[PDB]
């Protein structure tokens, strides 16, 4: 009897929770309002701007107006998701390490695994069902093959070379500097050039293109999934916008709305995105484009996690750090350990104790007022209607 309403959908109970990842197609299809403006509320200062951060199609938290999408009060609207489109792909702050590890294990040009079924060690690795250990072993084995082999000796005869379709190019060595992934090409000594590894910052779109070219057998071998957990999805292209329930505005007075930190960060994200877009179409020099892309990456990275190692912390206008999404869940007072394992309750009291030698062993003396405040829902039946009537 929750909701104070009636619905014809059957009641059921949760049995499984299948995790996964959004495809950009899903983010687009789910969303009902493409956020477009860095402002929330109109120039009349009475209603929210349509297409802004507080678009009425997402929902409302106030108790007077109802949601435009579902026409329900604030006590029944869950909230609906928006989305924001990015000019250029951005790395997700939570999968940089996995992206680099899976990048070092795949050829940068042909988009294929550096090994195949011929090697015995590959048979040993593919014999393991545990995905974590499998990936760790494959990484620690294939991190050291900087050149793709065109021909491989046959298992039946080592003197017979079979072509595996490899490109034969030279793979770089990748390191991480802040949010950037920098590669170094160690040219072969037989080329006649010095052993100077040319350095270059790898472009995210190129890495995305490489990942999009991987196949299903390599999908399974690496430890990903075709339906829920493709690696191409680990790089952001569209950013979902949470409804105002997730970021509630506290209104002291009619025109006094203190907004949440999350909406300020989202507004800054969109501001940087539109700045990068307007510089992109204006034919600006490449240096400004690179700087703007770096700023956008910084904002998107510190929107989710604000404790990244080796970087400054995104601060608020008053100097306090911005509370990211991770800091909401990680703490002792966070969601898991502060609102889902233990929580405050109703129909309870708390008071000092004393000693009574006249009471029986299993009997407790309850004060009068505490007995007048707490209740019990007794059901009216033929056996109690007289006493219950007198009680009423």
């Amino acid at each position: 009897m929750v909701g104070q309403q009636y619905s014809s959908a059957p009641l059921r109970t949760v049995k499984e929770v299948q995790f996964g990842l959004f495809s950009p197609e899903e983010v687009r299809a789910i969303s009902v309002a493409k956020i477009r403006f860095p402002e929330t509320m109109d120039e009349t200062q009475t209603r929210a701007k349509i297409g802004g951060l507080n678009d009425p199609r997402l929902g409302s938290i106030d108790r007077n107006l109802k949601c435009q999408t579902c026409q329900e009060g604030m006590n029944e609207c869950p909230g609906h998701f928006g989305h924001i489109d990015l000019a250029k792909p951005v790395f997700h702050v939570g999968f940089i390490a996995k992206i680099k590890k899976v990048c070092e294990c795949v050829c940068m040009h042909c988009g294929k695994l550096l090994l195949d079924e011929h090697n015995e060690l590959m048979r040993q690795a593919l014999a393991i069902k545990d995905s974590k250990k499998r990936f760790a072993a494959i990484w620690t084995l294939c991190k050291t093959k900087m050149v793709c082999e065109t021909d491989v000796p046959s298992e039946d005869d080592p003197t017979q070379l079979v072509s595996r379709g490899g490109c034969g190019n030279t793979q770089p060595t990748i390191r991480k500097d802040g949010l950037k992934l920098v590669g170094s090409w160690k040219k072969d000594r037989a080329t006649g050039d010095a052993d100077e590894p040319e350095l270059r910052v790898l472009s995210t779109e190129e890495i995305l293109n490489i990942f999009k070219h991987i196949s299903v057998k390599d999908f399974t071998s690496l430890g990903f999934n075709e339906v829920f957990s493709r690696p191409e999805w680990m790089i952001l292209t569209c950013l979902p916008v949470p409804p105002p329930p997730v970021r509630p505005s506290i209104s002291f007075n009619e025109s006094q709305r203190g907004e949440d930190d999350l909406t300020f960060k989202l507004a800054d994200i969109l501001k940087a995105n539109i700045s990068l877009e307007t510089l992109e179409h204006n034919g600006a020099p490449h240096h400004a484009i690179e700087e703007a892309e770096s700023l956008l990456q910084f904002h998107v990275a510190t929107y989710m996690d604000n404790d990244i190692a080796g970087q400054p912390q995104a601060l608020q206008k008053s100097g306090r750090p911005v509370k990211s999404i991770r800091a909401r869940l990680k703490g002792k007072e966070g969601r898991i350990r502060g609102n889902l394992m233990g929580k405050r309750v109703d129909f309870s009291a708390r008071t000092v104790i004393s000693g009574d030698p006249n009471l029986e062993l299993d009997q407790v003396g309850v004060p009068k007022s505490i007995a007048k405040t707490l209740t019990y829902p007794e059901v009216v039946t033929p056996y109690n209607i007289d006493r219950l009537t007198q009680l009423v």
Partner: protein
């Protein structure tokens, strides 16, 4: 219906635990308090829990306990045929 074990091949204890007893008493007390028919000769009692205990004393509660084995199969025991310690 493959999970159900035939009555002859029942290999669980023929006594009833304290947890089963508490669950049965709670269910019967709730049903009595929701105006269900009483199967025993009530004598001056007006508390559903005590009438539930009274019905348990004469073994007249018409309920069946289903016990879940770890694999998924189950075993059905009537409340009448479960030995209750006193």
């Amino acid at each position: 219906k493959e999970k159900a074990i035939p009555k002859d091949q029942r290999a669980t204890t023929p006594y009833m635990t304290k947890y089963e007893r508490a669950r049965i008493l709670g269910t019967r007390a709730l049903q009595i308090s929701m105006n269900a028919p009483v199967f025993v000769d009530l004598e001056g009692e007006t508390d559903p829990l005590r009438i539930a205990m009274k019905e348990l004393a004469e073994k007249k509660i018409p309920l069946v306990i289903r016990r879940y084995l770890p694999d998924g199969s189950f075993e059905d025991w009537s409340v009448e045929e479960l030995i209750v310690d006193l």
